[PDB]
Short mmCIF file of C-alpha atoms and ligand atoms in Angstrom, two decimals:
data_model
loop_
_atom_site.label_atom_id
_atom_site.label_comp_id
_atom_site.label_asym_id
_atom_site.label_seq_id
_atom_site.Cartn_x
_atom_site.Cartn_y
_atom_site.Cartn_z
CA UNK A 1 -8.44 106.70 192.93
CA UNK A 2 -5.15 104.76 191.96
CA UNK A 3 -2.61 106.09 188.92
CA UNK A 4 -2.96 106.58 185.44
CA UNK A 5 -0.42 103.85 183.67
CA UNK A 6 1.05 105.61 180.41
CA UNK A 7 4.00 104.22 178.26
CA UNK A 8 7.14 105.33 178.38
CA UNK A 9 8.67 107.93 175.53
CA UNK A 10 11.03 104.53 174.40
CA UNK A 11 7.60 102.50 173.97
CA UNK A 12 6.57 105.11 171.39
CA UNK A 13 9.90 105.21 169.15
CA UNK A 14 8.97 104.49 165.92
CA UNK A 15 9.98 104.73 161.86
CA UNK A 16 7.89 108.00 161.32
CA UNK A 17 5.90 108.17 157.74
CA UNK A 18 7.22 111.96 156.77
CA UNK A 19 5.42 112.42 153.81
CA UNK A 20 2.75 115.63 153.24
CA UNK A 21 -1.07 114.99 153.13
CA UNK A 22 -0.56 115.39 149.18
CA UNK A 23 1.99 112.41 149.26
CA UNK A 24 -0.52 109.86 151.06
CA UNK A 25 -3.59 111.25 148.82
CA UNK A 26 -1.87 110.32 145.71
CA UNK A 27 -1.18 106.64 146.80
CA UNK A 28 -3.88 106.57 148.80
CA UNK A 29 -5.82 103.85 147.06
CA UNK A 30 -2.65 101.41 146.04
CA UNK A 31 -1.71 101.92 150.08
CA UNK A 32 -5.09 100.61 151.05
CA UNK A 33 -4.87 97.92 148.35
CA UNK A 34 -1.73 96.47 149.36
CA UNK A 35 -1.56 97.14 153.32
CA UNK A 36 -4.85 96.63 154.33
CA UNK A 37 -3.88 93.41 156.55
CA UNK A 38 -1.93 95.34 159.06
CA UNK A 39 -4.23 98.21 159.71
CA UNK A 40 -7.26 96.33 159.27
CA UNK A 41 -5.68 94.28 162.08
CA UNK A 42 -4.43 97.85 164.16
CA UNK A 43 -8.51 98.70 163.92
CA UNK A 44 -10.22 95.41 164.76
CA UNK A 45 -7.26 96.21 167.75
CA UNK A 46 -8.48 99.75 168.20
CA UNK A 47 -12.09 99.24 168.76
CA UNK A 48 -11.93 95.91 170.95
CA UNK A 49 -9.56 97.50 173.10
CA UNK A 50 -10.73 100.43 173.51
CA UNK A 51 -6.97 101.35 174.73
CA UNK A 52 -4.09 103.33 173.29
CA UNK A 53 -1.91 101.62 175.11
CA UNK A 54 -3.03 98.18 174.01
CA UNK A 55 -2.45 98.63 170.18
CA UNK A 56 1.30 99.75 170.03
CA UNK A 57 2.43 97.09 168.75
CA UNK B 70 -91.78 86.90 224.62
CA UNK B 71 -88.37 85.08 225.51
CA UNK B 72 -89.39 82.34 223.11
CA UNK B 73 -91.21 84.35 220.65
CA UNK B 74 -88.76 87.80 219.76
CA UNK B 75 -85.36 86.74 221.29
CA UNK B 76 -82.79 84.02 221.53
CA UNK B 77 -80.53 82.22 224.13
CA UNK B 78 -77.16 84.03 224.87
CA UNK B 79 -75.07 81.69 223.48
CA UNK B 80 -75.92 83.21 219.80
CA UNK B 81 -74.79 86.54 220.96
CA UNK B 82 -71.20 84.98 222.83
CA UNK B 83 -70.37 83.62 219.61
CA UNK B 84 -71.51 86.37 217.50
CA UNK B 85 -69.00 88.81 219.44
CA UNK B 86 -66.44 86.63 219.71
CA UNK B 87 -66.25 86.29 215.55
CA UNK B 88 -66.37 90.11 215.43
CA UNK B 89 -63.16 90.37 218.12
CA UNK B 90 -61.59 87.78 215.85
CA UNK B 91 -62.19 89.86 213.08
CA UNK B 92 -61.24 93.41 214.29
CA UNK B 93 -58.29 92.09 215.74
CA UNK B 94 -56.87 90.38 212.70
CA UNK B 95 -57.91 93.85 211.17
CA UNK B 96 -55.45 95.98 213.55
CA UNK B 97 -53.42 93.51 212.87
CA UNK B 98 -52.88 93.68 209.54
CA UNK B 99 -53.08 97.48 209.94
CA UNK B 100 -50.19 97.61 211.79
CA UNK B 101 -48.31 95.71 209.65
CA UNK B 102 -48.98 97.27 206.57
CA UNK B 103 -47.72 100.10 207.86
CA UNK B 104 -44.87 98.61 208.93
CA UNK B 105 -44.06 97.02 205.67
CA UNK B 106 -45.03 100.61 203.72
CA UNK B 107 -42.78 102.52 205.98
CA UNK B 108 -39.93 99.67 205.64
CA UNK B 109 -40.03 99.48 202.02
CA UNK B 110 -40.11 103.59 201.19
CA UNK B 111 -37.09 103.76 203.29
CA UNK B 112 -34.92 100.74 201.01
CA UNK B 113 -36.73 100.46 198.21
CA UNK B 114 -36.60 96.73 197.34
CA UNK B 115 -39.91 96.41 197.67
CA UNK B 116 -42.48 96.23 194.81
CA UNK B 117 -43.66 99.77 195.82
CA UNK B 118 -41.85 102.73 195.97
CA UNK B 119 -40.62 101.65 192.56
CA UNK B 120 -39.02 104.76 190.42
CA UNK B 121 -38.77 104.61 186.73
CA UNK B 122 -35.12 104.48 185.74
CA UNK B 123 -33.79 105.21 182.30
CA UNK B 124 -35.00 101.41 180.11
CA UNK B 125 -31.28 99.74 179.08
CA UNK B 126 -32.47 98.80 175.31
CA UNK B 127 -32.18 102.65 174.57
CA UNK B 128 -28.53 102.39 174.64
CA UNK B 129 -27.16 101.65 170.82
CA UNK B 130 -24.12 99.14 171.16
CA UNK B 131 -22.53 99.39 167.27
CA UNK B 132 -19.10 101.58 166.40
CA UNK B 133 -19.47 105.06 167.38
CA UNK B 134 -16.63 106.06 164.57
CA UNK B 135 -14.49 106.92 166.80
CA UNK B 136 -11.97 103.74 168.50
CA UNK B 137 -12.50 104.63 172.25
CA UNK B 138 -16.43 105.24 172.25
C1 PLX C 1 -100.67 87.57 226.69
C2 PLX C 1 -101.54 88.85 226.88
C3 PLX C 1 -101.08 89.70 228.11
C4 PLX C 1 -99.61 90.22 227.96
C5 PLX C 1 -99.42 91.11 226.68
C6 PLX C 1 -97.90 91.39 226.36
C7 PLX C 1 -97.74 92.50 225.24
C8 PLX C 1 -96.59 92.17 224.23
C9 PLX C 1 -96.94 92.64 222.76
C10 PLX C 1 -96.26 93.99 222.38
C11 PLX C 1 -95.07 93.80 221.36
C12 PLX C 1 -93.90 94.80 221.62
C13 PLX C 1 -93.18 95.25 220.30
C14 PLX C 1 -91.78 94.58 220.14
C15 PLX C 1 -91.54 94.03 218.69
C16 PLX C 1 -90.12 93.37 218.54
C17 PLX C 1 -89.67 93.25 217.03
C18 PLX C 1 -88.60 92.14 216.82
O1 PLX C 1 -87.82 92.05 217.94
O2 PLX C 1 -89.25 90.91 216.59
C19 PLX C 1 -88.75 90.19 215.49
C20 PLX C 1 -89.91 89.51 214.73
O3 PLX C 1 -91.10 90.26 214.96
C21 PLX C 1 -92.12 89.53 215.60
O4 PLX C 1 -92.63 88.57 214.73
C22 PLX C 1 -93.26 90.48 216.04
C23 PLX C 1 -93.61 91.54 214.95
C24 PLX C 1 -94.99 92.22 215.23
C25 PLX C 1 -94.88 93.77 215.42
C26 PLX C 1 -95.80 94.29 216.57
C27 PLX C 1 -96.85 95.36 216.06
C28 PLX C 1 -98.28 95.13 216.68
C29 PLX C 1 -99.01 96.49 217.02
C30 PLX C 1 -100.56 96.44 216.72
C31 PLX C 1 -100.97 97.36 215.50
C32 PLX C 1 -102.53 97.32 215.20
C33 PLX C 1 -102.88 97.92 213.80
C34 PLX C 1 -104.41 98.27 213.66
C35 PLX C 1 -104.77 98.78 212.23
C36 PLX C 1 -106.16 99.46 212.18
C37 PLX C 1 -87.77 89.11 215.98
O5 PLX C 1 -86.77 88.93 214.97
P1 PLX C 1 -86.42 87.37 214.48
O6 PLX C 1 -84.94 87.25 214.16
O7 PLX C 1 -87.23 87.06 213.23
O8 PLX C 1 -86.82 86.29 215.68
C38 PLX C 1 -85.81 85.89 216.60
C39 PLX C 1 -86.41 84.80 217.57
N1 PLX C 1 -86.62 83.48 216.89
C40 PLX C 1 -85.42 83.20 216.07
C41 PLX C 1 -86.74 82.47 217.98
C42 PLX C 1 -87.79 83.29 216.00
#
């Protein structure tokens, strides 16, 4: 019953955040502090959507 | 003894004729009920033959802390 549209592997290049779990724990609060616009923006995007492939961007 | 313990035959015309009326409409409806019972089991968009299903207002529509359900 009709095809499954994914994104191509160029729609998910991306700068990759390489640092361990330890890394992010440490700044874990200043990172929430200072970049909560964007992801509080990727998960308003998340749960409307209910889509992967709607919140790439 | 016509005068004093019966009456003229006209009472007893009309009398029958209101009880054919009657059964008739009876069989009548009868038949149709059946009908209409029969008819409605078999869809079941009638007001009988109604099933419980499972009540909407059960369902909890909040975040499920998870993004896709
Ligand atoms: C004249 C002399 C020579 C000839 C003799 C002829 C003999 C005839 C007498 C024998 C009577 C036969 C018994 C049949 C009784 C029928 C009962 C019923 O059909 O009558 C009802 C009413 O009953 C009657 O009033 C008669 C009831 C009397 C019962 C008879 C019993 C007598 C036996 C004697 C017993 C003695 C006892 C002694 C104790 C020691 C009628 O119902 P109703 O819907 O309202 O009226 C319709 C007609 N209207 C509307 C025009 C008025």
């Amino acid at each position: 019953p009709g095809i499954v549209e994914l994104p191509t592997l160029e729609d998910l290049k991306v700068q990759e955040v390489k640092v361990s779990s330890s890394v992010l724990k440490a700044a874990a609060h200043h990172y929430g502090a200072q970049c909560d616009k964007p992801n509080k923006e990727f998960m308003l995007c998340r749960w409307e959507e209910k889509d992967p492939r709607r919140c790439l961007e | 003894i016509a005068r004093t313990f019966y009456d003229g035959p006209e009472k007893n015309y009309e009398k029958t004729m209101a009880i054919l009326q009657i059964e008739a409409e009876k069989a009548e409806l009868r038949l149709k009920e059946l009908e209409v019972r029969r008819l409605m089991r078999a869809r079941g968009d009638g007001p009988w033959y109604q099933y419980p299903t499972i009540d909407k207002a059960l369902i909890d529509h909040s975040p499920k802390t998870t993004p896709d359900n």
